[PDB]
Structures are given as C-alpha cells and as structure tokens.
Symmetry: D5
Subunit: 147 residues, 10 copies
C-alpha cells in the first residue's frame, strides 16, 4: 500500500518531453500506491538534482530522482553521469534515505524514448524508480525503532 510514506520527486528538464513522461510515470505509481500529494520539484539539468534531493531528504522518507542524459559529440556525457551517480549516492547515505535513480543515461535519443513510459516505450524507469523508492522506505521502516 505505502500510504504513510512521505515521497519527494525531483525531475530535471533537459529533454523536456522525456522528462515529463518519467515524472508522469512516477506520479502515477505514487497515486496507485495511495499517495496523491508527493512533493514534486523541477530542476534544469541532472547535475542540479543532488543538491535539491538533499533538501528533500531532510523531510521525506524517500526521493525519486528523474532525468535524461543522452550522449552527444563530446565526453561531457561521462561527467554529467559521474556527478549524478556520486551525488545521489552521497545524499542517500548522508541522509539515510533511499534516493531512487530514474535518471536515464543513454547513447541515443531512441534509447531514452524507449525507457520513459511514453506510449510506444518498452518500459518506464520513472515508474520503476518510484517502486524502488517506496519499497525501500517501507523496508527501512520495518527495520527501524518501533516497539
């Protein structure tokens, strides 16, 4: 069910059509699980996600990070992806809070489209990440102090 879980979702905006679709999947999983009012915040790019996730983790049980990084002509793809990976990992462990990674990292636009839960997509990593976030919050809840 997961109805008492306090959920935040932060979604970057680069490749907005794809980002909006990941957000839609995340919000739909949340609503399906009895959460109609997750905290939803938008940032410009994937690199902006961790600092916002850090703020949200102070008062949520779980944060879903959503965005889309697609490789271009330069090495910059590598470093955007390294920053996000390093940042979200650090935020989760500093805050002892699940930070689910639904940031697509693809070689091509077609690969990102296929993973965003658009109408013809094979899958929706935004929805998947949201399941991960909720299930992990629930597990931590059962492990922690209650008596």
């Amino acid at each position: 069910d997961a109805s008492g879980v306090r959920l935040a979702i932060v979604a970057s905006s680069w490749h907005g059509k794809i980002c909006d679709a990941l957000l839609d999947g995340a919000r739909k999983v949340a609503a399906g699980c009895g959460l109609d009012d997750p905290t939803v915040v938008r940032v410009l790019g994937a690199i902006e996600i961790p600092v916002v996730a850090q703020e949200l983790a102070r008062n949520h049980d779980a944060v879903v990070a959503l965005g889309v990084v697609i490789r271009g002509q330069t090495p910059h793809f590598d470093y955007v992806c390294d920053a996000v990976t390093q940042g979200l990992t650090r935020v989760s462990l500093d805050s002892s809070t699940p930070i689910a990674n639904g940031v697509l990292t693809t070689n091509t636009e077609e690969q990102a489209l296929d993973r965003a839960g658009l109408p013809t997509s094979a899958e929706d990593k935004g929805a998947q990440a949201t399941v991960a976030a909720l299930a992990t919050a629930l597990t931590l809840r059962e492990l922690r102090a209650h008596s």
Copy 2:
C-alpha cells in the same frame, strides 16, 4: 563463527539468479552455526547500500547480493559505480565488513555460472558470506579484549 551477527541484503532484479546467491549465502551461514541471519530484500542493486547502512548499525557483518547485467545502454556502468561507491563507504563509516556478492556481468550466462546452480563453476554468494564472516572474526581478534 556462531556468535557473529550476520545480515544479508539481496536485490531482486534477475530474481532467480538473486535467489540462488541467497541460497548459497544462507547455507554457508548455517554451516558456520548461524541459522537466523537477518535477511532483507530490495528491488535493485542501487537500493542495497542504504539498507546495508541500516544493517551495519547492529550486525558484525553484512553480505550484499545482487545481479547487474549489461544491457543496451551505459546504465550498467552507473549502477555498478553506485554500488561500489556505496558499499565501500558504508563499510568504512561503520567499520563493519560489507562483502560484495553483487554480480556484474556482460551476459546472463556469466551470471548463472557464478550463482552456484547445479552446473555453475562457482557461487559468489557463498564466497561473499565466507568473506564477511572471516573478516568479522579477524576484526574480533584484533579488537578490545579481555
């Protein structure tokens, strides 16, 4: 090893392979005198470190189990980077062994060959449990007594 407090956290992507790793881990534990390790499941490998962190608070050792198989994109690289960074940090923050039994393979056949099924060449779940327990016993002997 009968006095050591063991936890095992196993992700669930590639479930049959995950369950096989957990079977090898549980059997090593029981053979060493531990019938009741703390066992927790998470969805994907990325979710392991935050749960391992909670478990390290009150266990002498934690075994991380899972299966990451390279797909069409670079996502594989980043999942594996996050697990590595995460487990390493948790071990040092907590001064507790966090054994890495998370398979990272290019193919399913490679993962199956490492999950200790009837035809597998090895069982990395079992190996990771031996590592966890041996390291906990080592730290026990190095630490404050008597």
Copy 3:
C-alpha cells in the same frame, strides 16, 4: 525573477577567449534575471576551481563554475575532468548550495567554441549553467524555512 539571489561565478583561464565567452553568457543571464553585480573570480585552470568555489559558497546562494578542458595527447584530460567533477559535486553537498557546472570538456577546440555562445555557436553552456544556478537557488529558497 532572481533579483534577491547572491550569485558568484568562478571562471578558469586556460583557453581564455572561450572562457571570456562563457563568462559573457553567464553575466547576460544574470543581468536578464535582475542581477547586475555577481561576484566574479578568475583562476588559472579547471583544477583550481573547486577550492575557490568552496570559498564562494560560504557567502552566495549559487555559484557557477566556468572553464574549458580540451583533450590533448595524454590521459591527463581524464584526470582533470574527474577532479573537477568530484570537487564541484562535493562542494555543492557540503555547502548545500547549487554549484553549476559550466566547465566545457571537449575533444576538440571546434566543439568548445560551438558551446561557448559566440555568434555562430550552436549553444552557450555558460548561459545554461547560470540559468541552472539561479533556478536551483530559487527552488531551494521556496523549499526552505520561510513565513
């Protein structure tokens, strides 16, 4: 608008004409958003950015890092880029302040120029990074304590 946010820009100096172009883009975004007088500091190379950005974060709501790293004949490109990624990421999370990454990391000079918002450039990553910094500061302000 961003007229209340305190913005700092630290720009390295290797490939100076491109750095100055990035800085022009950054200042123009800042001025467009109501900020005529951002704190602007220069350093020699990209590796020198994080320690200065850390200092600026003590006193600013957002910092924009600008610079240009272009691949040469050795692996050193990789380790410069790694150091910058690692450092900017840490500084952001230690200080709970957006540190926007406008450090170009390209294979060729042509690619760097095409991303510095010169007249025939396809884009301006210095401008983009400043939008990122300011928008993230505004978001954090709304999330944080006010009455």
Copy 4:
C-alpha cells in the same frame, strides 16, 4: 498532529512519578490523534539520550521523561548535566525536537507537584508532549513542500 511520528522514552528511577509523567504524555498524544506512539523504558535518566538518539532516527519528535531528585551528594548535579548535554546534542545531530520532561527537583514533593497527579499544580509530561508535537508541526511547515 495525527500524521506526526512520536516516540517517548521514560526512565524508571522514582517509578510512580515516572509512570504519572508517561500517563500525561500518552493522553496528550492520543488527544492529538496519536494512539500508538513508540514508548520505551530505561533505568535512569543517564540512559535516556542514547535511546532518544536511536528513536530520533525514525520519529519526528521524541519526549524524554524522568525524575532526578537531589540526594546527599553532588551526583544529582552530574546526572542532570549529562541529560542536558545529551538531549541537546541528540536534538541538533538529528534535527528533531527532543522535549525535556525530566524533572530535576530538590525534594520528592516538588517532583510530585509536577507529575500531574490529582493534587499536582502541573504536569510536565503533558507539557513536554505538547512541546514535542508543536515543534514537529512547526518544522514540517518550515520544511520542503509541495
């Protein structure tokens, strides 16, 4: 306040007075919509902060209850110093309100008068619970939404 996660840790020295403080705390909680706060008992006041620390990890607020009454020695001073230092540290480390309902009196009569028994002038357990809940709701409104 029906969504706030409340914990109460109460020491046990001067048990009847401790139980009276806990009664006032529980009743405030239930009146505010919380029938099932996490409630834990410890022996003496010195033991409260380490338990409050554990509870702060997964509660929005913690109420510390207990009773320290001055005896023949300076020990009273040091028990109260440790509780004060401890609760203050835990609150700030965890960014969670830790309400102080630990009575520190010179006499038993003073403690009884503050435990919300039929003839008591006040109930510091109840007061501390109001403080905990009000502060949690305040921090909720100051923090990140929506």
Copy 5:
C-alpha cells in the same frame, strides 16, 4: 543598512506577555533597518528554540532567539538555561551564522519585565539582540568573499 540581510526571529511563549514585548522590540529594529518581513516563528519553551534556530540558519543570515526563563522553586531553571546556551552556541558555529541570544534568564518577573522594553523598562533585550544579529551578519558579509 541591513535591507539585504535575511533575518529570522524565533520566540518562545512561556511568559507570553513578556515574550511578545521582546518580539515587538525585535520587529521594530528590523523595520527601522529596512526589513518589514523577517521570518518569525513561535515555539513553546526556550528549550525548543535551538532546533528551530538550526532550521532557520540554513536559509537566513542571522537568527534572533527570544524568550523568558524565570527561576522557580527547583534547579530546573539552571538546566533550561544550560540547554539554551549550549544549543544556540553550537548552532551558530555549525551554521557559521550569528544567533543572537535575547533569551532572558532572571531570578524574578520584575527583572524580566525591566528588560523587555515596556514603557517603564530600563532596557529592551529583544531590540538589543536584533541589533546584535544584524550587525554581526553585516560584519561577516564584509569579511567574506565578494568583489
């Protein structure tokens, strides 16, 4: 001139008439310095102040703590005052933000009234605390990174 400084005021409520008087002096100082809308938060008792001050320090340049602790029949007064002192001191240094202590600690009510800036009072410590917060914030601004 403190028009640019972001001021928060947190005031406890034990001895409410006196607390309100301190807050009145604080608000008047802020307004005189060009700040008509400081963030103002009320808490129950003085012991509740530091955790709220901690939250406010993340988003403000100065925080003013107001309240009134008067010695009763027990040693409890001493421990309330100890908690406030240790707490505000730690928050100031953790956050590198001035936390002005306008929390009255008196033996009697007459003493608290005389320090709350009512018509017949010798002084207003609410007002004094606010001057202290703002002046120290402006000092730190000068000392820190700017152009």
Copy 6:
C-alpha cells in the same frame, strides 16, 4: 537474561578499595545475568576512563564506567567530575552505545564507602550501573534492525 550482550567494564583505581568493590559488584551482576567473561580493564583515574571507554565501545554492546571521585580541599573535584560527565556522554552518542555511569562523586569518604557495595554499604552503584548498561543494550537490540 542478557547472555548474548557483549559487556565491557572500565574501572579507575583512585581510592582502590572502593574501586575494587564497585568492580566486584559489576562483575557479580554480569555473572548473575549469564556473562562470565566481560572485558575488564583498569585505569588510574576517572579522567582516564572516557578514552578507554571509547575503545571498548567499538566492539561491545555496553560499557560500565566505574570510579570514585571524593571532594578534597580544592576546586579540582568539580573539574574531574565535569570531564568524566562530558566524556562519557560524548562517547555514548559517538558510538551509539550505552555507557553506564558508576563513577561515584561524593563530598566525603563515608558517602563513597556507602555506595560501593562493601559489606556495610547501603548500596552498590557499580551493580546498579551494570544493570543499567545491560537493560539499555537489550532495549537497543529490540529497537534495531532485525527482520
């Protein structure tokens, strides 16, 4: 019962007859509760206790601190007691481990003798502290991750 609790006891040596009696009570409570082999370490004075307790807390579920401070002709009593209080409190919270305080702090030798569980003593604070330590370890065990 408490038989799986890993217990350490550190006892200072100033006023050795009294210290030895506190240690005897602690060890007897431990044995009564099914622990025949607690880690037992001796230090010279009460000020030496916290650094040793810190080491022991790394691999025990609970530490009992035992010693005897009796006021003399100077203020030094105050500062010995402040150090021990500050140190043990910090060790408990750094290590998230109960550190039971069985350090006597008395005005007179007679008061310390009366609290050491010697034959004619009214009480034994070494035994009391050991109960506190074990009961708290057991409670934390029930609050922590088990599933």
Copy 7:
C-alpha cells in the same frame, strides 16, 4: 613574531574598557613588529565566537577581547558560558590559538584594574596578545617545515 598573521575581535559592551583592552593588544602587536592586525568589532561578547571562526580561516592567531560584568541576574553566567564554549570550540576546529582576553568580573572596578589604563594593576588585552603570538610561533615550530 613579525611573520604571524594576527586578528583581533573585540566586543563593545562597556566600550571604554573594551577600547583599553584593544589598545593594549595593538601595542603588543606593534611591539613585536606585526603587520597591521585584522581588527573587527562586535556588539556583545556572545557575538565573538562566530566572527573569531571566520577570522581563524585566514589568520595564525585570533585575540578575543571584551568585558562581561555581573549584573542583577544570572545572565552574566550564561554570557560567560557561551564565550568559553565557543572560543574553545573555534580553537580546536581551526587548530588556531584563540586567546581569551574577555574580562569576566563582578565589578566595574575589577575590569578597569585589568584593562591596562595608567592606574591598572594588569592589562589582559596585552597578555592575551602575547599568548596568541607565542602559541602561533610554537605551533609553526611543531608543524611541517624544512
């Protein structure tokens, strides 16, 4: 001592006395050949630690100057407690000497007698600057060099 980077932060409560401590400190620094010390004023003694923290980032030593005189209430005690806790913390966080030239007296006569005016028995502003410089030199000698 000419090479040491000195900062002085003085509060302003009892301004004439604070100015006298500052005069003593400045004279010592000039006597030891110091470059123009960084000098900052704050309102009250409680404001000193946070400004001393800023200054310790860029200086080899900081001298804290101020005057706290006991009044009718317990407030004196908490002002002094805050200054003591703060300065001590700042010194150890920054690994920098923070010399304490904050007078804490019962009377105005006692503070005047310690502020190094012509009829004063002592100048604690001067003393504090000597302590700051001596300690900075010692730490330089202890630390990494040729």
Copy 8:
C-alpha cells in the same frame, strides 16, 4: 614498562616555579618507565594548552598537560578551568589518545605548592598525570590491533 610509548608534555608557564616542579615530576616518572626523551613544549597560560595538545596528539601515544590555575579576585578562575576541562576532554576523544590532566586548579598558592612535588609537598600531580598517561597508552596498545 613504557619504553615503546611516545610521550609528549605540554606545560603552561603562569606560576613558573610550580610549573617547573610539575614538569620535574613528569620527566622523572617518564625516565623511571624507560623514556629519557619525551617531547616537551611550553605555553603561556592554561587556556593555550588544548590547541598545542591537539597538535602533539597527532604524533604521540600520550600527552600530559601541566599547569597551575589559582583562584583570584574575579570569576575568571571558573572560565579558565572550564575551558581547559572542555578542551583536553575534546582533544582526547577526537585523537583517541590519553590526554592526562596535570593542571592544578586551586584556591590558594599553598595548595598548589602542596601538589607540585616539592620536597615538603604532600603529593605530585605532575608525576601522577604521567603515570596516568603512560598506563593508559599501554592499556590502549593491548586493546588495539596486534598479532
């Protein structure tokens, strides 16, 4: 014996003849225990001890703090003693190194002399502190990792 332990002694200089007497006691214990060449550093006042002790703890197994604080006409005695207590305690726990407190805190000069191990002194707190430091280092060595 203690011939392998690395000992440092930091002694303040207010009341110099008494400080030198404390230091004599410390060196004599150290030499008795096999250590002819402890690191010895002088500071001006007791308040200067903790920051120097912190430095010495990076490089030594034990540090002995020596000094003499005698009550005067004002409350300042109290705050000097508080600062020393607080600082030595923190340094010990940060560094996981025994920091022995041989700082006399007396009401009169007579009491200080009677505790400095001059010929007619009742005791020698400088010697006592060195026994404490060395014995605690040896205990910690046995508790810690060896094979």
Copy 9:
C-alpha cells in the same frame, strides 16, 4: 632506520601463491629495516582489505596492503579494483597514515607473477610497497611535532 616504526601488513588470499610471495618480500624489507615482528593479518579478497587496514591504522604508523586482482571474463575486475582504490585512499586520509598499495591489478597471471618477486620476476611490488610505507611514515615523523 625504521626500528621505531609500527608496521602492519594486510594481505588478501585470492591467488595465494602470489600473495605469499608479495608478503615474503614485504617481511624481508621490514626485517632489513630492523622490524622482525610487523603485525600481519590475512583476509579473503582484496575488497576485504580496506576495513581491516582501517582497524590497523588506529594502532600503526604505516599499513601495507597486499593482494592480487587478475582480470577475468567479466567487468567485475574493474569494480574490485575501484573499491580497493577508493577504500585505501580514504583510510589513508581519515587516519593520516600511509597505506601503501601493493595490490596487484593485472590482465594476466604471468603479469602478476612477474611483479611478485619470485626468482624469475622483473620486480617485487610487495617489497616496493613496504619501502613506500616505511619511508612515508619516517617522513611524516620528521614533519610532525617533536623537539
């Protein structure tokens, strides 16, 4: 002359003949420098090294990490090596203690054998790592507080 330095060696056991060869070279270096009894600890795999190195660093002036990682059929090699690198680097800096990296990371067995100081080997990285640890410990001793 490293007779005074406290050396620990932690060696993993995957590729045991090669690990033993590295340890042989390490022990011979230590003995040649006047250290007949370094603390030696064995672990299973390279990933187990950093947590044990962390324990040893609390009680030693230098730690030597030995082991052998050889590339197999999967990417696992890369992550084992990443973990070792991140771990030892963090432990060195947290503990301010040299942690020498004598962990071989090769593509083939022949390469690992050639670096393990067997009769036909081009070099002994176990021996090299031990020189590195001891030399760096002696350097730090010179740089740190002494007389």
Copy 10:
C-alpha cells in the same frame, strides 16, 4: 606572492623527470620572491596525498609533483585514480590549493616533453606552481581582512 607559504611534495618514480618538474617549480617560486619552499620527497605518486595533507596544515598552498607512465597492466589507471581522489579531497578538507603537477602519460617521451627540459614544449611543474600561488593569492583576497 612573496608572502605565500609554499610547500612542494614530489614523488621519485622516474626520478630524472620528477627532478626536472621540481626544478621548474623551484624556479617559479624563486622568481616570485618566495621564502625557501618546504620541499618533501616521497617514493610513488600514491604516497603524495597523505604528505600533502600534512603540509596543508602549515602552508597556503601545496604543489604535487610526480610522473605516472602507462605500463603493460591496468595499474596506471588506479595509481592516477588514487592521486586524483586524494589531492581533490585534501584541497577541500584543508581549504588549501593543491596544484596537480603529476604527469600522467602513455609514454616516456610525453612526460619528458612536459617536464621543462631545454627541448620540452612545456613545464607542468612550473605551471602547477603558478596555479598554486595564484590561487593562494585569490583566496587571501576573498577572505577576512581589513
């Protein structure tokens, strides 16, 4: 730049090349009027960060010098990863510039060409010392002063 306290730590693997980087660094420092920089040698590049950490306690800037050249195995990659992670951490922990003059090349010719010998196209030891000094001066200007 005459007032800046400079430290240089150089590793010794490929000793002739390391000595050339050190020569360039020393020449820059002497050119900018620097007091005798603190100079320390370590064996390999991996040993640099811990010694740089010590030096950053007592200096305004540290220059890290060394030579890593790719060999037959992946070892080059992990040596460089360690140096990068370490220096970056040390700089931010100490809030001190740690300039990276550690060459990371595929060949000996590439390192020689970057070590500022007469036929060299570049001197990265010199470049690194300029970066260190320039950054120290900038931070001084940004920090607390008159």
